[PDB]
């Protein structure tokens, strides 16, 4: 109900099937390179390894998934605080950009606000859990042909797109007419 | 009154559907050979039933007499043709 802001997040499991040291890195909007997952969690507020893994792995008895995340724990070993984690991404001013990027750009569905991160980190964890669940050959790769995962845009929705656009230009024209009224 | 309800492919995943009200759930204990071969209830763990299986179809296909006795491509072609046909499109 608030604009049509789309941003696709990718959780990329590096390392091929049979390649040792399989790392997990994430793509962030307006961020030049990939970021190791633990660095995302640290920049969000989740610092201890066990707490980061607590968000990804939902069962203690699952060593398989836990051995799958051991290289991620190493990948961001050099970072042990939110301050330096946010700093990684991207003066000084570079940290704010990163803090703002995490709230405005990263997972805008859920929230685009400020006071959350816990909801964002848990979800990021759910995403990785699902990525591993497949990678561990426990789950079947998501079917992009399942009808339930597809929506049909009708009269109303299509008119609404146009109307939003048209009304904004009208709104803009009123402001230009207001600005021109210097006398 | 909750006698009927709306389902989408997503929720469809969690439900078990009977095809016929009677022919899919009375009981168990001679036959018409001319009549087609209809399997068994077997699964009984049902949550819903199909209003009418013919409703899987839409406008064009709904016009065909016995598509259940036709090859599948012939039903697709007929569906294309009924849109080339002539008749009273409106009273006005």
């Amino acid at each position: 109900k608030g604009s049509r802001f789309i941003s696709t997040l990718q959780v990329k499991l590096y390392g091929r099937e049979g390649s040792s040291a399989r790392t997990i890195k994430a793509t962030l909007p307006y961020i030049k390179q990939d970021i190791p997952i633990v660095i995302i969690f640290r920049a969000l507020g989740i610092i201890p390894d066990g707490e980061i893994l607590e968000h990804i792995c939902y069962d203690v008895n699952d060593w398989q998934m836990l051995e799958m995340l051991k290289p991620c724990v190493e990948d961001g070993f050099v970072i042990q605080d939110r301050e330096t984690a946010l700093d990684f991404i991207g003066k000084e001013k570079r940290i704010q950009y990163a803090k703002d990027i995490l709230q405005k750009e990263f997972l805008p569905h859920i929230t685009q606000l400020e006071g959350f991160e816990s909801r964002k980190a848990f979800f990021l964890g759910y995403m990785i859990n699902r990525l591993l669940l497949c990678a561990l050959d426990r789950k079947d790769q998501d079917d992009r042909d399942h009808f339930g995962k597809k929506r049909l845009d009708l009269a109303g929705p299509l008119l609404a797109q146009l109307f939003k656009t048209l009304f904004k230009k009208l709104t803009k024209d009123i402001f230009r007419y207001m600005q021109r009224t210097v006398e | 009154e909750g006698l009927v309800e709306y389902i989408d492919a997503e929720e469809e995943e969690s439900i078990l559907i009977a095809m016929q009200p009677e022919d899919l759930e009375p009981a168990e204990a001679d036959v018409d050979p001319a009549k087609r071969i209809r399997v068994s209830h077997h699964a009984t763990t049902f949550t819903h039933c199909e209003i009418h299986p013919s409703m899987i179809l839409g406008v064009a296909a709904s016009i065909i007499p016995f598509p259940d006795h036709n090859q599948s491509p012939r039903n697709t072609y007929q569906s294309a043709m009924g849109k080339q046909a002539m008749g009273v499109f409106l009273t006005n």
């Binding site: - | 009200p21 022919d23 209003i51």
Partner: peptide, 30 residues
């Protein structure tokens, strides 16, 4: 009896009920 179960013929009353309320192009209107 009013409590008795439905037959496959009884389906057509429900279908008639459907369209008598929705018609054929409700998606559009709705």
């Amino acid at each position: 009896d009013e409590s008795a179960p439905i037959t496959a013929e009884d389906s057509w009353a429900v279908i008639s009920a459907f369209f008598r309320e929705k018609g054929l192009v409700s998606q559009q209107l709705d």
